[PDB]
Write a protein that binds this ligand. Structure first.
Ligand SMILES: Nc1nc2c([nH]c(=O)n2[C@H]2C[C@H](O)[C@@H](COP(=O)(O)OP(=O)(O)OP(=O)(O)O)O2)c(=O)[nH]1
Ligand SMILES: [Cl-]
Ligand SMILES: [Cl-]
Ligand SMILES: [Mg+2]
Length: 290
């Protein structure tokens, strides 16, 4: 069987230092990570396990990649992120007895596994002090036929509401701070739970609906960049016919290659920016899908 895990290169400003952990079970030095709990998304697992193992909270930025290796039971699949420490301090735990903070070249030496070393090379290849734009497709909301009444008003269904609730921890893992949604009830409702958590209002965005994108895709592009330019990490909840077009455009111009792709309801594109420039685009499946 495949064991799914997530973790990070945890970093702080000293130029940058990264955490390497020691485990007496293997007398090994490695990166903080662990297994996904039932129902848990990779980002949320990563944040948890980082804090379990290092004693630090972190905000996840760019996704580093996936690595896969044999273990006695089968196969270990681990997703890694760059993650900046937001606080805390190490104290020894059950698995991890020591942690060191190292500049990257020394950390590469301290590491011992090829997969960890690969992830660390991925970390250094781009800027890590990134800002993050979270582009979310609204949750499940039945079919446009099944709900007559102004389709603008069609609500999230039971699943979609559960997706919205699950997106709170997902989006908070990336340090979401400001909320925007296309002018459709289902788009707002997707991020209402996060709005309440953050105690933030949701900015309504008539230029980012499907109808508006179809009429004037250029105004949508410009408005996306306007939003991305504001301070904070914005969530922008919009629709299925809008997202691929915006993401594809921006990735092509920035020469950013996504490691994964898709467009499902409740999915999230994590766009990482350095000094306003796009440097990563990471598609996350819906929180209730694999
Ligand atoms: N942490 C880590 N372990 C690895 C890598 N490559 C590699 O063969 N291993 C080995 C170390 C162990 O002998 C074996 C399983 O270690 P593990 O850290 O993946 O799994 P674990 O279940 O003991 O710990 P975890 O997922 O709960 O943190 O795999 C790697 O890149 N990182
Ligand atoms: Cl520490
Ligand atoms: Cl829909
Ligand atoms: Mg672990």
């Amino acid at each position: 069987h495949t064991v799914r895990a997530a973790g990070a290169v945890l970093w702080r400003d000293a130029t940058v230092e990264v955490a390497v952990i020691h485990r007496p079970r293997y007398d090994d030095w490695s990166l903080p990570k662990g297994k996904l709990d039932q129902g848990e998304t990779e980002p949320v697992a990563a944040a948890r396990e980082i804090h379990e193992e290092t004693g630090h909270t972190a905000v996840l930025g760019r996704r580093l990649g996936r690595v896969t290796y044999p273990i006695p039971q089968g196969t270990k699949r681990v997703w890694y992120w760059a993650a900046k420490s937001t606080g805390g301090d190490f104290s020894p735990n059950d698995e991890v007895d020591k942690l060191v903070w190292l500049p990257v070249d020394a950390a590469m030496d301290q590491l011992q596994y090829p997969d960890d070393r690969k992830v660390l090379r991925r970390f250094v290849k781009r800027p890590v002090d990134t800002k993050t734009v979270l582009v979310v497709r609204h949750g499940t909301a039945g079919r446009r036929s099944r709900y007559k009444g102004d389709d603008r008003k069609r609500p999230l269904d039971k699943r979609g509401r559960a997706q919205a609730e699950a997106l709170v921890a997902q989006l908070m893992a990336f340090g979401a701070t400001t909320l925007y949604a296309a002018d459709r009830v289902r788009c707002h409702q997707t991020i209402e739970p996060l709005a309440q958590e953050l105690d933030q209002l949701i900015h309504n965005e008539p230029l980012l609906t499907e109808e508006a994108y179809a009429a004037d895709h250029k105004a949508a592009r410009k408005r996306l960049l306007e939003i991305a330019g504001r301070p904070g990490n914005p969530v922008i909840c919009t629709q299925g016919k809008v997202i691929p077009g915006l993401i594809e455009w921006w990735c092509e111009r920035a020469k950013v290659r996504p490691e994964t792709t898709g467009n499902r309801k409740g999915s999230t594109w994590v766009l990482s920016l350095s000094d306003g420039e796009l440097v990563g685009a990471d598609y996350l499946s819906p929180p209730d899908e694999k």
